[PDB]
């Protein structure tokens, strides 16, 4: 057909930016598109399994998650879930992380099959915070943007996201609509359900929602898929009878399935002029906490700085962790290039950068799961006054006449080789400028030359005054130091793969 052919072409432009978003917009036109899209994606999965390709298993696993979550109803005739489960059941033998990824998908399919719509209600319920007492959870989206540097285009997105459109009464209505349609299909009277729920007060809507949510969770703990769905249908049918609209469900005349979208999450906004994340602690005056730092090229380093700086600050002095479970998300307006060579899927969607961006950003935050740990270098700085400090630097380090303008010393060094066999050396030198340029590093000694080095130690000469800057810092400068030892080294940043 024309529609089916177009979907296949679009799905290619996403397996090869706005292309992935365009795919979601096109398939959201009608409920039938999702099932058609599911088969086409699943067909490409079989080719991978029959050729052993690796680079195209990360994308397909995400799309399948996305699409099943959006899809309103699964007709009993079509068993595409069983087809998908068998296709991924033969991936357990692949090497890590591929085997690990597909094991999660198998768990995702089991919950959906035994209790349809369980996944979608879980996600939105946490986002809106309307979690029942028996199962409490929450997710809070907190942006940190600098109007001075961030363009107003991104600020408007935060403004639109920060606008609280959905209300707690509306959210309970929407979730109940999704729960009933997902199991009863076109036999449910959507207009009848919507009209009769509107008159319901907030208390009864929450109480009814509590009963339905508990039933679905119990259903997922049932052995046989067929019996589990049957048990849910009986329970859902009974709930409708008790609620007072049994005729709304199980209508003999089929209706038209309505594509229920995903409501926007609880987003806030704050001015990130100061890179130190103390402001996040100020916002205070396991549930998740979504951090969405924006970044620029220069603030990339100070991003890393505050990032790792607050990270270990909490590791030892945990304050926020007591209320949430932090999860960080970088967004470009050094870290760029890092994820640009390590996560191509992250490169196309986010690095390539309601309005389009707000929908793109909301998708980014909702399904990104793979943590990333950045490379850092730990340094110990010893002064002459009996004071010692510990710092973390990644970008570079400079010292001397050149460094001072921008903003004898004993040298010990210890290179090593891949095998764990190294060569310590004691080569003290006199120069007017010493710089460490970046995993290993490459020292600099403007006497000019550059030398590969992995671990270094520099010692001063009888309180010789000198200023040292970390990562070309313009404020944190240490003067008249006596020693500095540099060596290579939850709330991590998130990537799709």
């Amino acid at each position: 057909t024309c529609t089916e052919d177009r979907i296949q072409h679009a799905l290619e432009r996403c397996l090869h930016c706005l292309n992935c978003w365009s795919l979601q917009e096109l398939v959201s036109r009608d409920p039938g598109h999702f099932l058609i899209l599911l088969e086409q994606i699943l067909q490409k999965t079989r080719e991978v399994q029959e050729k052993g390709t690796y680079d195209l298993l990360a994308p397909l696993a995400l799309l399948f998650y996305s699409t099943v979550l959006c899809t309103p109803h699964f007709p009993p005739d079509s068993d595409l879930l069983l087809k998908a489960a068998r296709t991924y059941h033969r991936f357990l033998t692949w090497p890590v992380p591929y085997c690990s990824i597909c094991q999660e998908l198998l768990t995702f399919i089991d919950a959906e099959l035994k209790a349809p719509g369980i996944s979608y209600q879980r996600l939105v319920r946490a986002e809106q915070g309307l979690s029942t007492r028996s199962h409490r959870s929450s997710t809070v989206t907190v942006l940190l943007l600098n109007p001075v540097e961030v363009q107003a285009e991104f600020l408007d997105v935060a403004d639109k996201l920060s606008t609280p459109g959905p209300s707690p009464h509306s959210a309970y209505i929407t979730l109940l609509l999704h729960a009933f349609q997902a199991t009863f299909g076109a036999h449910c009277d959507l207009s009848g359900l919507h009209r009769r729920l509107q008159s319901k007060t907030l208390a009864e809507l929450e109480a009814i929602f509590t009963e339905t949510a508990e039933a679905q969770e119990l259903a997922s703990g049932i052995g046989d898929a067929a019996e589990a769905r049957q048990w849910l249908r009986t329970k859902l049918q009974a709930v409708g009878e008790k609620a007072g609209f049994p005729g709304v469900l199980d209508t003999a005349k089929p209706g038209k399935l309505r594509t229920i979208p995903i409501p926007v999450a609880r987003c806030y906004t704050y001015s990130w002029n100061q890179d130190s994340f103390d402001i996040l602690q100020e916002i205070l005056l396991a549930s998740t906490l979504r951090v969405v730092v924006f970044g620029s090229d220069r603030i990339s380093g100070k991003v890393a700085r505050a990032y790792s700086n607050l990270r270990r600050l909490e590791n030892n002095r945990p304050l926020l962790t007591r209320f949430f479970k932090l999860q960080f998300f970088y967004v470009p307006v050094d870290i760029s290039h890092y994820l640009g060579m390590l996560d191509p899927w992250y490169e196309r969607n986010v690095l390539g950068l309601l309005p389009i961006l707000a929908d793109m950003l909301l998708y980014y935050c909702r399904f990104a799961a793979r943590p990333v740990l950045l490379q850092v270098y730990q340094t110990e700085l010893t002064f002459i006054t009996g004071e010692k400090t510990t710092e973390i630097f990644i970008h570079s380090l400079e010292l001397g006449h050149s460094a001072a303008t921008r903003a004898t010393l004993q040298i010990i060094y210890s290179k090593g080789a891949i095998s764990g066999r190294s060569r310590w050396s004691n080569m003290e030198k006199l120069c007017t400028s010493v710089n460490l340029s970046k995993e290993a590093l490459t020292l600099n000694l403007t006497e000019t030359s550059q030398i590969k080095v992995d671990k270094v130690q520099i010692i001063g000469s009888n309180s010789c005054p000198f200023a040292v800057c970390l990562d070309q810092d313009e404020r944190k400068i240490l003067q008249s130091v006596i020693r500095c030892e540099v060596s290579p080294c939850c709330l991590p940043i998130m990537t799709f793969s």
């Binding site: 890590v96 094991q103 095998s419």
Partner: protein, 984 residues
């Protein structure tokens, strides 16, 4: 949930806890789970808190024997303890969680002695990236135990040396009227008695103690002790003659008859069996079911849901094999030159390279990094059990190889490799036995290291065990099949021939001689083809009742056969050999263990139970393993474990005897050092050291290394010396330590340093096997195979032959010297004629032997002759068939073109021997090959072009006669060459 009772250590009486554990839960989880129960139930929680789950052992009794579950990465359901309990209807069983203990003083002391004897610390765990060796040490206890406790005490203490072969032709004559005379000695009364050559020693006594019953007073035998309280013994040796065998089926009697010397025996008391007691074992018995993982029907994900998946069968995988090469790093560049280098990885089975790969050239600097995936066409489910990942560095500007190293893709557990490995590479300075080595270079200081990544998997990828499961061709094909089965062993099989053999696989099985050709055609890189073969081998009744042909049973233990079932039947066939047969192929079974790709195999286990059942196999087994440990880095650890398992079973008697021999070898090594490190002062210094050494508590009596029945005693210092050799060997001369010796002859030995004598024990083990061949035809070519042995790092203990002299000296080229020399030594004509008899019967034996083996062309200076006329070669470091200088034929009655009554009896004899060997062409061709590889193909082509494989008897019977003549023209020119270069 499977219930199990655990007997907790502390109580008033020991306390027991009943715990239900998952059938597929791991043992380590059971340790933690049991720990929590104790803490919840303990009457004294402090005792179970300070301790930990990793400081205990889980013991269980099986038929009165305590067993311990050595492996920890195992599921409960797989334990043999569950199987044993359920068969006996015990549930829940008892598992004793006994606290571990540190080694005691005696145990540490005993281990110290063993480590010194072996020459290697078996406890070392430094240069190992796996736990195979320690598992082997624990598991080889079961072999030993039963054999140690299945021995006959008296026969094992006395160890009679019997044979079963029939008497040859040239010894039936020497038993006239079926009678033999034995000179029985008792104190000072040495009287001769006559018995029948088919009488057992148990009888020779009966008659003796009846004849002399009235005259027992003269004999001085104790009156109370009867004819059962004594045993005959060879006078001057520790070789008893006991048991129930004919007095003609011993090996001392047959040696005397060959030399025409009366048999001298002395009555003696039986050696006490109490002197062979063994130390009770310290280790518990490892669990029996450790090498078994399960069938493909239980290790496969298919047919199961992700909920219960724990193990993944290898055959379920279907991906192309893949490795990641990171790079290499040499600490200091050996040479600074403008050359490029590149790595390559190959998969292999035996010498068959299933697939290869390579990487782009890069400059050869002190550190090269690639970090590249290499993906091989072979599917991961096509990997056989003995796959060998071979990493090799090649160089270039062809390609000069520099380094190689090997890894086992399926380790000793049936589990694919997974992780990061950094491996140090050997350095090569076509093929060899050393190149199949799965050992990593211990020189971790200036050796290249290469880093490889093999992908990790969420579950263990295990190799399952095969399940035993259940007209005539056209005459042309049958005739064509017969031709292939009947070619020389070195002959290759073409692909078309392989299809015929593999297609006709159930037709050849019934023919026992076709096995080494059937299995050379199976395609091992395909799961089903190997699966078909196992079904084929399920029924092998033909090969289980076919005459044993050591030539065939040796063919299967070569390199090519890397299988576990093909090798296991061959070894099963070797389990027929008799002690006499075993002693002839020892140094060739031991030197063939270098091919078993795993440590604990059936060959190695066979080598030890034969050892621990007989004393004379153990003695020589001790010395052949001991030499490999001390001078072959590539196979030290495998051989160290093997020897340790034996040394714990031999006994305190032989252990004392093995200590004393090692001291003398080590002290004399020091003495060699002194003189070598630096002119009559050399002689004077030797006397001082030797006199000091005798004063240095040198053992008063030790068994000679190469003759267990001969106990050399106090040194004789006036006859020792240092020859005029650059290596300066010691002409040591000892004397017997047995008062019953009937002669005052000494015991000469040469202790030599500066050369490797592993070859000499081969080209002298081969000949002794050829001597047995020419005995299977009742021929007695009179070779002189002397004793020799290699004991360590370029040191050797050669035996001295009394009354010998080198031809180079009987020439210090005048032609007539040789003949006059023998005349002078034995002017008596009768002795001279008898002497020239031997000089011919043995100038052939050596013309033959050194021509078949391809080492005929030798210098005059390396040939000798005993005074009784016996020629013999020594020092086994344009061509000639052999050394047959005119002088030799001069002594046969020949000169110019004449033919003497002896010259013809030489040619007659010569050929009459060659044709005897041709009847064993297969054996000579398997043993030549084995030697070569495991010793030092165009090289191995010599043993056919010269053993006449192909043409028929007449075509050969004229082959070697033409050779004998070829030499008759050479005369004295080749020897010129030799001495010429050796003097220039």
């Amino acid at each position: 949930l499977i219930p199990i009772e655990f007997v907790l250590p502390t109580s008033k009486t020991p306390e027991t806890a009943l715990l239900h554990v998952a059938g597929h839960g791991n043992v380590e989880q059971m340790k933690a789970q049991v720990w929590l129960r104790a803490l919840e139930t303990s009457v004294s929680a402090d005792f179970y808190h300070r301790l930990g789950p990793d400081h205990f052992l889980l013991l269980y009794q099986k038929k009165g024997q305590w067993y311990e579950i050595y492996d920890k990465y195992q599921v409960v359901q797989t334990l043999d303890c569950l199987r044993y309990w359920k068969v006996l209807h015990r549930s829940p069983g008892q598992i004793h969680v006994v606290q571990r203990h540190a080694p005691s003083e005696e145990t540490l002391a005993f281990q110290r002695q063993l480590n010194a004897l072996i020459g290697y610390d078996v406890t070392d765990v430094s240069n190992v990236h796996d736990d195979e060796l320690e598992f082997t040490r624990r598991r080889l206890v079961t072999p030993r135990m039963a054999e140690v406790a299945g021995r006959d005490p008296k026969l094992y203490a006395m160890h009679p040396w019997v044979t079963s072969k029939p008497l040859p032709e040239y010894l039936l004559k020497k038993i006239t009227n079926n009678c033999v005379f034995i000179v029985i000695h008792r104190s000072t009364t040495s009287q001769t008695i006559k018995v029948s050559a088919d009488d057992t020693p148990g009888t020779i006594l009966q008659s003796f103690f009846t004849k002399m019953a009235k005259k027992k007073s003269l004999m001085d035998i104790p009156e109370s002790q009867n004819e059962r309280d004594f045993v005959l013994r060879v006078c001057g040796r520790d070789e008893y003659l006991v048991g129930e065998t004919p007095i003609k089926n011993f090996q001392w009697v047959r040696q005397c008859l060959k030399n025409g010397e009366e048999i001298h025996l002395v009555l003696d008391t039986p050696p006490d069996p109490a002197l062979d007691e063994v130390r009770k074992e310290e280790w518990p018995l490892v669990d029996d079911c450790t090498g078994v993982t399960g069938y493909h029907e239980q290790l496969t994900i298919h047919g199961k849901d992700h909920e219960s998946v724990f193990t993944v069968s290898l055959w379920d995988c279907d991906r192309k094999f893949r490795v990641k090469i990171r790079g290499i790093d040499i600490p200091v560049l050996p040479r600074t030159a403008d050359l490029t280098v590149f790595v390559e990885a190959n998969i292999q089975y035996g010498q068959q390279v299933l697939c290869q790969r390579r990487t782009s050239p890069k400059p050869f600097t002190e550190e090269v990094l690639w970090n590249v995936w290499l993906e091989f066409s072979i599917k991961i489910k096509d990997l056989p059990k003995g796959a060998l990942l071979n990493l090799q560095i090649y160089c270039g500007k062809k390609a000069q190889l520099l380094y190689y190293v090997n890894l086992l893709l399926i380790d000793h557990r049936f589990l694919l490799r997974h992780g990061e490995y950094v491996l140090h590479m050997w350095q090569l300075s076509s093929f060899n036995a050393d190149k199949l080595t799965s050992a990593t270079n211990p020189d971790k200081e200036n050796s290249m290291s290469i880093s490889i990544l093999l992908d990790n998997y969420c579950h263990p990828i295990a190799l399952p065990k095969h399940r035993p499961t259940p007209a005539e061709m056209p005459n042309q094909l049958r005739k064509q099949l017969e031709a292939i089965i009947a070619t020389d062993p070195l002959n290759p099989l073409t692909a078309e021939d392989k299809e015929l053999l593999w297609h006709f696989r159930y037709e050849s099985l019934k023919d026992p001689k076709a096995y080494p050709k059937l299995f050379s055609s199976v395609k091992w890189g395909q799961q089903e083809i190997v699966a078909k073969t196992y079904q084929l081998l399920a029924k092998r009744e033909v090969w289980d009742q076919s005459a044993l042909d050591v030539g065939l049973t040796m063919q299967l233990l070569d390199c090519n056969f890397s299988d576990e079932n093909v090798r296991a039947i061959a070894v099963q066939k070797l389990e027929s050999l008799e002690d006499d047969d075993v002693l002839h192929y020892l140094l060739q079974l031991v030197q063939a263990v270098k091919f078993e790709p795993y440590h604990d195999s059936a060959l190695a286990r066979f080598l030890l139970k034969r050892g621990l059942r007989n004393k004379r196999i153990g003695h020589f087994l001790f010395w052949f393993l001991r030499s490999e440990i001390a001078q072959s880095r590539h196979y030290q650890q495998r051989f160290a474990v093997i020897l340790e398992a034996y040394l714990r079973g031999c006994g305190t008697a032989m252990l004392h005897d093995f200590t004393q021999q090692v001291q003398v070898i080590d002290m004399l090594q020091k003495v060699t050092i002194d003189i070598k490190s630096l002119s009559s002062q050399v002689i004077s210094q030797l006397k001082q050291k030797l006199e000091n050494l005798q004063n240095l508590n040198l053992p008063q009596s030790f068994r000679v290394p190469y003759d267990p029945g001969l106990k050399a005693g106090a040194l004789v210092i006036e006859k020792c010396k240092v020859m005029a050799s650059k290596k300066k060997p010691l002409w040591l001369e000892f004397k017997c330590a047995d008062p019953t010796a009937l002669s005052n002859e000494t015991i000469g030995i040469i202790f030599k340093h500066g050369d490797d004598l592993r070859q000499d024990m081969l080209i002298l083990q081969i000949l002794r096997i050829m001597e047995s061949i020419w005995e299977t035809e009742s021929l007695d070519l009179c070779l002189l195979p002397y004793g020799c042995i290699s004991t360590g790092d370029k040191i050797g203990m050669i035996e001295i032959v009394k009354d010998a002299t080198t031809i180079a000296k009987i020439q210090q080229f005048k032609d007539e010297v040789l003949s006059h020399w023998l005349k002078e030594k034995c002017p008596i004509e009768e002795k001279f004629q008898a002497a020239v008899e031997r000089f011919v019967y043995s100038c052939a034996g050596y013309c033959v032997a050194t021509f078949v083996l391809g080492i005929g062309d030798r210098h005059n200076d390396n040939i000798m002759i005993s005074e009784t006329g016996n020629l013999f070669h020594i020092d086994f470091g344009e061509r000639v068939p052999f050394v047959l200088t005119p002088d030799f034929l001069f002594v046969m009655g020949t000169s110019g073109k004449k033919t003497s009554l002896h010259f013809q009896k030489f040619q007659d004899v010569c050929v009459k021997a060659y044709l005897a060997l041709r009847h064993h062409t297969n054996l000579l061709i398997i043993l030549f090959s084995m030697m070569l590889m495991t010793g030092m193909k165009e090289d191995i082509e010599y043993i056919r072009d010269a053993l006449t494989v192909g043409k028929s008897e007449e075509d050969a019977k004229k082959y070697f006669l033409d050779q004998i003549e070829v030499c008759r023209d050479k005369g004295w020119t080749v020897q010129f060459n030799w001495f010429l270069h050796l003097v220039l």
